[PDB]
Each structure stands twice: as C-alpha cells, then as structure tokens.
C-alpha cells in the first residue's frame, strides 16, 4: 500500500505527444529514479471510447514482470486524469533507429529478435496474454541496449493453447492474414509480427508496402514474400516461416508456441537463459550521457516545455512491490 | 525509412 500523486514527482521533459495524451520524463522526489510517466485526460478516454484499452493495459502492465516488457511502478488516478509510472527507455524506438541507419546485420537482428521472442514467449506461456501489435515503434532501447516492448491496450488476455480472438486491430502495415481476412485467428498473430519486424530489420523495408490500406492488404493476403539476395539462407528460412500466411503452417503457429521459434537454426547457439538473464552482449548501446539526455526521441516534442474531468476508475491504483 | 505508423481497433 503506497499511494501516489503527482506532488511525488518533477517533470522534466516531453518524451513524446501519444494520440489520447502525452508521455514526460519524470524524477520521482523521494527516490531520485526517473521514469516516464504517461498521462491521459480521463475526458479523453471516455469521449473516445478508450477505457477498455485503458484498463487491459493497466492489467497487463501489472500482471507481468520480465526483463524485456516495460515494467509499471505506479499506477493512479486523479479527478482530472488516469497516470501510468513506466520504466523509462532512455533507447528511444528502435523505429528512430532503423529510420538512420537503414539495415540493421543479421547479429544484430538476431540479438532483438531473441529478447522479443523470450518475451513473447512469457506473455503467451505464462500470462495466457497475446499482444498483437508487434511493431518498431513499440520495441524501444534501455540505457544498456536491451529490447522493452512497449504499449500494451491493444492485448487480449486468457488466450490458451488453441483459443481464439475476433477483435480487428492491429497497425495496418503489421497485421497477419488471418487478422485480414476476418476468420476467428490465434497467438500465431504475434509470429507473423515478429516475422515483420525482423524482416524489417534485414532487409530495410517492410515486406508487403502500399501507402492505401486496402491495397496493402491484398498484397499481405495474395502475394508471395520475395528477399534480397545478399539475405543469408538460415534468415531467409526463419523470415518464410515466421511470414507463412497459413497460420497452421507457420514457424510458431503448433502447440510448442515460442519454442518451435527458439530451436530455428536462425537461433543456433543462442542459450536462451542467458537471453533472459541479460547475460549477452547488446551490440548497439544508446550514447546517452545521462538519464535527462534526449537524443533518441524526435525533435518536435523533446523541444516543447511545459515544465513543473470524468468518472472515478474503480480500482484502477497500483504500486509494484520493492 | 516508411512513415511511422499508428495502432487501430474495431
Ligand atoms: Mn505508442
Ligand atoms: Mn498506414
């Protein structure tokens, strides 16, 4: 029992404007840790119909611990605004990060791709939780250079062995043919994910593209995934797998889940306690001078300064223990 | 590098 406010923290700096609010750098006064802090108007939620999003993830951030999921600290509410206390990813996206450098090395992809799947691994095996939108923009960088996903409204909970989910959504660019074409699909959506970012990763650009959504899912439901030619075989063999369009056929899509995935040779000598334990070598490491340095979140919201209603979330509080 | 992208739900 340790109730929060917004007293118990500064606010530093605008980490970035989400859609139905807004993420800042915050000091908690007591401890001197910072964190980012996101901060909805609760007028907003109801007014866009955000609340069940809200809530699922208020519970999925508190019903999960791992090393490469984002942990909550704090959750609280106030007349005015719901408030969510967040390990704070000095990394930044790895989408900035792509967005410079183009390609990222087969190694390189490979150490993402390990901490994304020992992650997905836990929320589908030990939470029964789908997250279903897997994506650069939610695969953020620690201060070290390990993968925190990030953005968690868009899960579906008690999803078992086999079980099945009927809610269109997504990100357009991201989203399984079984999700297209309306059809009952289950947690094999988060391997098609994977498959889209790691494709990403290789090969500089998404695999299916068309600025016109509709368009875009024709190619995601009809066309055959084509590679670079310089893409090594065990890539090109984990990628065909992950991006088969069958959900039955796909690398991850049987009853072993995750580690159908983690024995691809793609993963050869890979030791995945050690993936766990943080026990490998990150081969990029953010170049933050301090906990305040900025530098990987983009210009127009690190720059704007604002330095320092509607109805009562039943239950909505929470403080992690320790 | 494609435009950033944003999440949806029906
Ligand atoms: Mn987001
Ligand atoms: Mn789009």
Redesign the interface.
């Known amino acids: 029992k340790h109730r929060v406010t917004m007293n118990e923290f500064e606010y530093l700096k605008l980490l970035g404007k989400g859609?139905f609010g807004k993420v800042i750098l915050v000091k908690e006064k007591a401890t001197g840790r910072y964190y980012a802090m996101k901060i909805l108007k609760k007028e907003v939620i109801v007014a866009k119909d955000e609340v069940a999003?809200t809530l699922t993830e208020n519970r999925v951030l508190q019903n999960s611990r791992h090393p490469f999921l984002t942990a909550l600290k704090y959750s609280f509410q106030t007349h005015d605004r719901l408030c969510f206390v967040m390990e704070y990813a000095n990394g930044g996206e790895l989408?900035f990060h792509?967005?410079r450098e183009?390609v990222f090395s087969e190694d390189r992809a490979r150490f993402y791709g390990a901490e994304i799947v020992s992650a997905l691994d836990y929320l589908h095996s030990e939470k029964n939780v789908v997250y279903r939108?897997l994506?650069l923009?939610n695969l953020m960088l620690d201060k070290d250079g390990h993968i925190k996903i990030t953005?968690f409204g868009?899960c579906k909970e008690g999803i078992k062995d086999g079980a099945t989910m009927k809610?269109?959504?997504?990100?357009?660019?991201?989203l399984a043919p079984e999700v297209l074409e309306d059809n009952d699909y289950g947690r094999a959506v988060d391997w098609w994910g994977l498959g889209v970012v790691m494709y990403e990763m290789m090969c500089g650009?998404?695999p299916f593209?068309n600025q016109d959504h509709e368009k875009l899912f024709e190619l995601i439901l009809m066309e055959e995934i084509r590679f670079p030619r310089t893409l090594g075989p065990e890539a090109k063999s984990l990628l065909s797998g992950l991006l088969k369009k069958d959900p039955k056929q796909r690398l991850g899509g049987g009853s072993e889940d995750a580690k159908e995935i983690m024995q691809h040779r793609f993963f050869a000598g890979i030791v995945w306690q050690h993936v766990y334990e943080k026990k490998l070598s990150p081969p990029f490491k953010p170049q933050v001078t301090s906990e305040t340095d900025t530098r990987y979140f983009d210009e127009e919201f690190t720059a704007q300064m604002i330095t320092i209603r509607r109805p009562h979330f039943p239950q909505f509080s929470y403080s992690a223990s320790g | 590098g494609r435009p950033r992208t944003t999440x949806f739900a029906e």
Do not use: N, V
């Not at chain 1, 809610?167 to 991201?174: I, S, W």
């Open positions: 859609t999003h989408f792509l967005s183009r939108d994506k923009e953005d868009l809610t269109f959504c997504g990100t357009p660019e991201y650009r998404l593209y």
